[PDB]
Amino acid sequence: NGRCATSRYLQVMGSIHDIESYFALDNTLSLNLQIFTAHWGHLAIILMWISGNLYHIASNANYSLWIKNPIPSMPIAHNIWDPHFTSSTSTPYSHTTTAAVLIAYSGIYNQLYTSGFSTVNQIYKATFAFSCLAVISILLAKIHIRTHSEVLHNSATHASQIPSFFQLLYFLDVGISSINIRLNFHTGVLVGFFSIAYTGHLLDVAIPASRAPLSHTSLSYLTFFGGLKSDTASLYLTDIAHHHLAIGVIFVYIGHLYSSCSTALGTYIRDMLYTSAIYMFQIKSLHLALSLALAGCAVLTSATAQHIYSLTPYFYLSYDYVTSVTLYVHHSYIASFLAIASHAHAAITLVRDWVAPLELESSCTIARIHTHKAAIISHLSWVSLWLGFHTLAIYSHNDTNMAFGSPSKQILIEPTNAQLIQESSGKALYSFAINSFGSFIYPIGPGDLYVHHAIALGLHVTVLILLKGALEARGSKLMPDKMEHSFGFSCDGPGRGGTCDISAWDCFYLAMFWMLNTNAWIDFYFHYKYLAPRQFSESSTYLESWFRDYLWFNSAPLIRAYSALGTNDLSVQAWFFLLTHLAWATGFMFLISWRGYWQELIDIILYMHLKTPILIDLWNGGVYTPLALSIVQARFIGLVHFTAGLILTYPPFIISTTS
Template identity: 35%
Template sequence: SAQVVWPVVGQEILNGDVGGGFQGIQITSGFFQLWRASGITSELQLYTTAIGGLVMAAAMFFAGWFHYHKAAPKLDWFRNVESMLNHHLAGLLGLGSLAWAGHQIHVSLPINKLLDAGVDPKEIPLPHDLLLNRQIMADLYPSFAKGLAPFFTLQWAEYSDFLTFNGGLNPVTGGLWLSDTAHHHVAIAVLFLVAGHMYRTNWGIGHSMREILDAHRGPFTGEGHVGLYDILTSSWHAQLAINLAMFGSLSIIVAHHMYSMPPYPYLATDYGTQLSLFTHHNWIGGFCIVGAGAHAAIFMVRDYDPTNNYNNLLDRVIRHRDAIISHLNWVCIFLGFHSFGLYIHNDTMSALGRPQDMFSDTAIQLQPVFAQWIQKTHFLAPQLTAPNALTATSASWGGDVVAVGGKVAMMPISLGTADFMIHHIHAFTIHVTVLILLKGVLFARSSRLIPDKANLGFRFPCDGPGRGGTCQVSAWDHVFLGLFWMYNSLSIAIFHFSWKMQSDVWGTVTANGVSHITGGNFAQSANTINGWLRDFLWAQSSQVIQSYGSALSAYGLIFLGAHFVWAF
């Protein structure tokens, strides 16, 4: 009852018995799975790794102080892009991948092979034993007995016992085959070591970035990329905008691979962690992409010089910004009305009791045929276009259920009418985000109402009644509104993922097949707004909302508090 005062602060809120064998603190970061993949088997190893990290951090701290206060590099050092590319590609990405591949091969692979076979962690040889005693490795991977002879005689296939092309997931752990990921890092290392030798520095060979950009012009692109080299070596905002856009997009790509190709052992069956990782990488990506729009707009206001950019691609984009923005506007209106219209139609037909007239897999079908074709081609690739791979890259393309300990790790994800509809909501929200951010960038210096916007700066308040139409038109305001729509985009994506996985993928494997968490209700419910409200939002939040008078109250209050933070 309301008279009972439940503890709301302190350790006891996490100690209450809330049923279901639930433990108060569940770590959902994926670190345990990552440590398992790295071959860490004891707390001592974690402890020494942490101390090593602290020592390195101290060294970097000193280096930062030294190169800022004692021997700061000149600006030209930062503008030497060819040296930067060579060092970052060959050093960071090339040698970094090679070093990681070495660790995976010599430490992670043997330890994980023994762990997967059920050997007690206390019995497993320590990393230095594996490195110094080749016989232990040769027992696990026979090609180790041959040493480097196959490498220097180009008999590289000899090493296929630990550098594999299996595809799919390890049935014991539900993660990618570690021998596949070691192979991947060796290949990546080779590619980046080559890439790190492509740019002209001390010797007169290799590419020059300025020459590449200046020569990059087509029949319809005027001066092409002329002038862009100077922009990117003189405006850190322009540089940052591009890097944020790329890094943010990469983070969102990572989000989609963490569940479809889970890289660490036992990650796929830890559903809370999978949900957290998807949410985390999407949010990081969203912030970075909005940041790209912000810094591109700051560049336009503070660093852009129209006199140095005549008829190059940037100038041409700015000159036909009206066409770009109006086309984007049209696309957003089209996507918004049509995708929302499909839902409105379905809700109406459902309310009128006419399921045969709804868009669904059992009535009027709108199958995502192109997506299904992509799934099929990837599933068939090992027999056709990728003959060296034993199975398809992801178990989500097709094939059998991969189950670990009676839980589904990954299985074919069937796409239907409900996915087709929500996909177009994704397209709508993402295009609106792009529209707002791009409009903020392209109109950062001037607009019809405020031709002197560049003089007012990146952000400025309304100019009052004497000059109508100056409210919420600064580049900063566009970033603010873009951020709002980024939240919209990501909420829909995370909702879609959360329900789809619980309905069609995650669950337990029984003698009768797979029993999914929400019983496969996505296809029949997610095609109406009411279905989303009732069978997803309410169904998954009602326990929390009704928790204020039980031992669960702490979690309910945290939930409420988090939403207050968002609201204000």
């Protein structure tokens, strides 16, 4: 199609991986095969990422020196080869005659060290092997493409005599879309047997590497101590091995649940769902499966974010002031993204996958939810309003009283429920000890109570927006016929009072801001309590403490990184602090100023180009005629700028303050 504008690129890039929207993707067979191949390529990318990390650790870094003195030493991420740096004098990242290096804040050093890596040769062998695994993944993608092509050819060449041969149309993608066998093998082999295999790895490599004296592998390597070994300040490796052994056994047992290879054994998921409380749903729906997987991944990512910090599993990881914060924040952000992703894909499932029954029929869980979506949304709004009103009001009361200089006048509600739960947990742990757990129990005060209620507000409002989008995706009082329109469309016009941000994609756009806010609140809470436990406990009850003792006070090293006096190793962090501020501010433009103004401006610019003497005779403007970004395109671009600035301006701050 030669007739095109510059919006062509953005329209394509917004759905490059929306395989269901592809032209000439006739059937679910094509859809599933394309998705499988994309998955293989994704695994190849992950393996190449692992191989690159390992290679750079081996070559550009100091793993061998670090493992000798892990406590004061700092791992190297990779060298800096940037021509723009000053050549007259040494940079802050060099030893005045040495290649510039970057410190590593990913904990991969601790990971390798407690896995059992002793020499750079082992890291090199791993780099090589993971590259080979990437090759294997790509070749498997090719193999499966060929096998599925060979089945289509067969079905074309051979036909059942009876007219029911068309029934085979449904079973061509059975290997990719079968649920019982996939569940059995995933939960039994990919999870349980993988855990058992890692137990074997620990017993064979990690335990001997950690233990100075040689001792034959035996049940003595399996223990149920708890807490952190004093020397490494981490969970006993012997306990990790038992842990994984136990989980592996349990999940290997659970992996015989469904009928996978024969119909003589196992039960059916259709049958469980039919007989259970949830009536039934489109288990075949790829969007629904993606939503469930994303929800599970989000909860697991949050769990690891909390537990890696609480119970240190890696040698000397706790000693690394910066790496702990970086890991927690990283996995918290990933978890938030995965949660909002699950919600967005549930909305998409409702839009284009769910087969709604007739209105009066109420047989499925989704229909039952749609019956009282109004009640759900109203109650969620009530909870959000209560939390916001009271949290903000108590914080403002404390703010005003502190500003007037009377801390005694502050409202300080003791967290009695959380303290009782914590005391019960401590009682259980003390009983176990009589038969250390660091950071699993924390002082907990009224400031913690207020911050927890703020985080609850954030979660409730995010879920409010996402649930409203999902439950109004098919229809709404303002736009009853929303099923016909795509998942994301600009608007419905200025009629009916105006219909800005009326689509389910627009609800996601809105919930993205909240996710970022609630995640920022969580990260600020963790970082403040981590940096200054005592000051946080005493002063975190009013917002001026957050604005002064946390942001303004700890912002000094970052902004002072590079100045008229000189530069230090945080100069890069200071430049990325400002670059990300600028990106956020740019996102404000696409978020505030909308398309008509920019289309008219583009028209004027195009007029100028067409009136320019030399340029007109070469460039007509007919092909890829410039245009202003569409409404949805600009919404997304502004959201991307906002998200990039917000997310990327934090790591510089945390590194500066914790380093």
